[PDB]
Design an enzyme around this catalytic site. Structure first.
Site, mmCIF file in Angstrom:
data_model
loop_
_atom_site.group_PDB
_atom_site.id
_atom_site.type_symbol
_atom_site.label_atom_id
_atom_site.label_comp_id
_atom_site.label_asym_id
_atom_site.label_seq_id
_atom_site.Cartn_x
_atom_site.Cartn_y
_atom_site.Cartn_z
ATOM 1 N N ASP A 1 38.129 36.312 35.483
ATOM 2 C CA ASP A 1 37.334 37.558 34.773
ATOM 3 C C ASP A 1 37.642 38.067 33.741
ATOM 4 O O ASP A 1 38.015 37.224 32.888
ATOM 5 C CB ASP A 1 37.450 38.586 36.124
ATOM 6 C CG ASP A 1 36.327 39.549 36.179
ATOM 7 O OD1 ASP A 1 35.877 40.266 35.477
ATOM 8 O OD2 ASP A 1 35.568 39.506 37.434
ATOM 9 N N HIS B 1 36.805 45.380 34.825
ATOM 10 C CA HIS B 1 36.020 44.825 35.720
ATOM 11 C C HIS B 1 36.848 43.722 36.612
ATOM 12 O O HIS B 1 36.872 43.657 37.852
ATOM 13 C CB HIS B 1 34.989 43.711 35.106
ATOM 14 C CG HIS B 1 33.960 43.267 35.957
ATOM 15 N ND1 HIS B 1 34.173 41.959 36.479
ATOM 16 C CD2 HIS B 1 32.811 43.629 36.695
ATOM 17 C CE1 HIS B 1 33.288 41.401 37.390
ATOM 18 N NE2 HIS B 1 32.416 42.553 37.359
#
Ligand SMILES: [Ca+2]
Ligand SMILES: [Ca+2]
Length: 279
Positions: A39, A69
């Protein structure tokens, strides 16, 4: 073990009915397993990770999570308060920049990295990879996900937030991995959630409280939030010895809550992740 006043998503995957607020789980809590979070990175210093998180690879100038995130997703995998598998080991691979974007060549390299890097980690109960990302269809990205799964890693990917058939999105459309749709706290399909025959399972995805950068917390929505629920559940089940990386997705579907969801189009599975915990 029981966590009172848990986030609704944790309570949902330990219950056969909506509306509860206690997360019931076995004390082993996924110890001995490993989850790669591919990510924007992980704020490894967050107190909620208890020193169980570390960055192992970045494809940009820094390994810091400048977005939030990836820190949110990792927290749903295995933070103390917001995580499914509260004792697992978390490895961060930063293939997305701090705006949340990344080229497909970098995402593919990140998956090839995990397939090799696991061979020099001590993960006796198994290895999981959580991919809360995607884009338009690409056979090269699908192929990279299939390679990672074939190498012996439980791969969980987001179905996408387009309210469309996931067949036109990658790596969501790769059949061999575990594609995850999202639901809300009233057992409805999240209105943004993709659907279709390629989906394997649904997880909680609307209004998910979890860790954020700056040592904080916040609540957000997406199939990006549903995926770490299933990735965390896989590692929890692998530590208990119920399943293996090669069959974790099927085991989760077989043991899921069946028929509880509404606004499921015809042809999409009506299955909600569930841990079947019994004291
Ligand atoms: Ca039910
Ligand atoms: Ca599949």
């Amino acid at each position: 073990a029981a966590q009172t006043n848990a986030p609704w998503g944790l309570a949902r995957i330990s219950s056969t009915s909506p509306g509860t607020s206690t997360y019931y789980y076995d004390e082993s809590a996924g110890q001995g397993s490993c989850v790669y979070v591919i990510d924007t990175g992980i704020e490894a210093s967050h107190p909620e990770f208890e020193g169980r998180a570390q960055m192992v690879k970045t494809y940009y100038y820094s390994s810091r999570d400048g977005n939030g995130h990836g820190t949110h997703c990792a927290g749903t995998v295995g933070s103390r308060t917001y995580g499914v598998a509260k004792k697992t080991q978390l490895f961060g691979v930063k293939v997305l920049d701090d705006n949340g974007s990344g080229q497909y060549s970098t995402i593919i390299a990140g998956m090839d990295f995990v397939a090799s890097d696991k061979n020099n980690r001590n993960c006796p109960k198994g290895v999981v990879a959580s991919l809360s990302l995607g884009g338009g269809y690409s056979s090269s990205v699908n192929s990279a996900a299939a390679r990672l799964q074939s190498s012996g890693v439980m791969v969980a990917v987001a179905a996408g937030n387009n309210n469309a058939d996931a067949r036109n999105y990658s790596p969501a459309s790769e059949p061999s991995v575990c594609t995850v749709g999202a639901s809300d706290r009233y057992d409805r399909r999240s209105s943004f959630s993709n659907y279709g025959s390629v989906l394997d399972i649904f997880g909680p995805g609307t209004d998910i409280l979890s860790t954020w950068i700056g040592g904080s917390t916040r609540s957000i929505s997406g199939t990006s939030m549903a995926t770490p629920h299933v990735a965390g559940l896989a590692a929890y089940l692998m530590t208990l010895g119920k399943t293996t990386a090669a069959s974790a997705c099927r085991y989760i579907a077989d043991t899921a809550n069946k028929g509880d969801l509404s606004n499921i189009p015809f042809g999409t599975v009506n299955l909600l992740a569930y841990n079947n915990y019994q004291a």
